[PDB]
Every structure is written in C-alpha cells, then in structure tokens.
Amino acid sequence: TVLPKDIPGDSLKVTVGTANGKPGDTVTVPVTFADVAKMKNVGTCNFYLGYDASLLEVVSVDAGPIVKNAAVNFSSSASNGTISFLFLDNTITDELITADGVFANIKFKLKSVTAKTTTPVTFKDGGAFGDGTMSKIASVTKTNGSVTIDP
C-alpha cells in the first residue's frame, strides 16, 4: 500500500556513482544530475555525502562539466568522513545548471583491506535544491553509491 506522497512522477535525480580498484588505486566517483530541464534547471543546492575514512582517502573534489563558472559558483570540502557540496549561480540568472550530466567528481585513494570490501557513499544531513528561480524543487530522488576495494 502506497499513497501519492510515496510515488513522485517528476523529480530531479541526484546519483552517487560507483568505482572499484585495489588498495593504492585512485578512483573517481561521480555525482550525476538527471531531469534538470524537466525540473526547470538548478540554480542552487547544498548537500552532504558520508564515506568511511578508514577505507577511503579523499584526494580531490572537483565540479563537473555541467557547472558553469565553478571557480565562483561551486564549493566543496571534506572533514571527518563528510563531503560538503555547495552550488549557487552568483549571477542568479545567467550561469544556471541547464544540462544533465556530472555535477561533481570525487577522487578517492583506496586503502588496504584483508578481504574484498564494498563501502557505501551515502547522502546525509539534509540540504536544499533550488530551481532556476531559486525555488524549492518539489521532489529530489537521492541515490547512494559505493566503492569496492579488492585486494
């Protein structure tokens, strides 16, 4: 039994990808947006991803190619197993996110394990997603990802 609140139709899709490698590898985990135009573009957002720092080292977090003027509009940081993301079109109208694709790329260096291990990279701690008018996007589908480390 489900109700309408449980089943969105239109939603912005925000998806953490997956990666695999062996200890010592550096892999890239993308954060991808879909249905951007449907949802009337993205003008601002902030959110947080959790990861296991005993298994992964954050090497870098960079904006993806859908983000215009990222040096001004995009910020990221990582502390104590949480990666923070913030985007705002600082022109408000002229540098919106208007295309589907990669919003950010996380580079993780893989640490040692004694057996093949899959570790999740997960949404936590709330946030905000605003459309091209900076208004709340009514539905956002957030999908977690992972890294598999195979010794």
Binding site: S76, L86, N90, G127
Partner: protein
C-alpha cells in the same frame, strides 16, 4: 532587534556576510540561527544564501 542576513553580527549586511554564510552552510554541523533563516523555514541552507545574494545584487528589496 533582528538584522536579517547579518552573518557576522556587525550590524551591516554586505559581501562579508555572503562569504561567511557560504562557508557556514558547508559545515555539516552548522547550527540554526534566526537572523540567517531569511525565508522562515526553520533551516539555514542554500535558499537563504540565494536570497541574500539577490538582495546584495539589488534584485530584491527585502530579505524574505
């Protein structure tokens, strides 16, 4: 009296407050602060940041 948008509590609302609120939002453990919740939704997040920037740019007359 509350000065909406006054991140650094200096009585003014200017670019310094915008820079501060950006960094504050990125702290996952940032606390609720009444003067930063300009849209009255009981959260401090990107929506508040966007309204502050619109105000600094002269696109809105009021922080609301």
């Amino acid at each position: 009296v509350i000065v909406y948008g006054d991140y650094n509590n200096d009585g003014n609302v200017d670019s310094t407050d915008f820079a501060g609120l950006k960094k504050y939002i990125m702290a996952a453990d940032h606390a609720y602060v009444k003067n930063l919740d300009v849209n009255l939704d009981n959260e401090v997040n990107a929506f508040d940041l966007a309204i502050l920037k619109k105000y600094l740019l002269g696109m809105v007359s009021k922080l609301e």
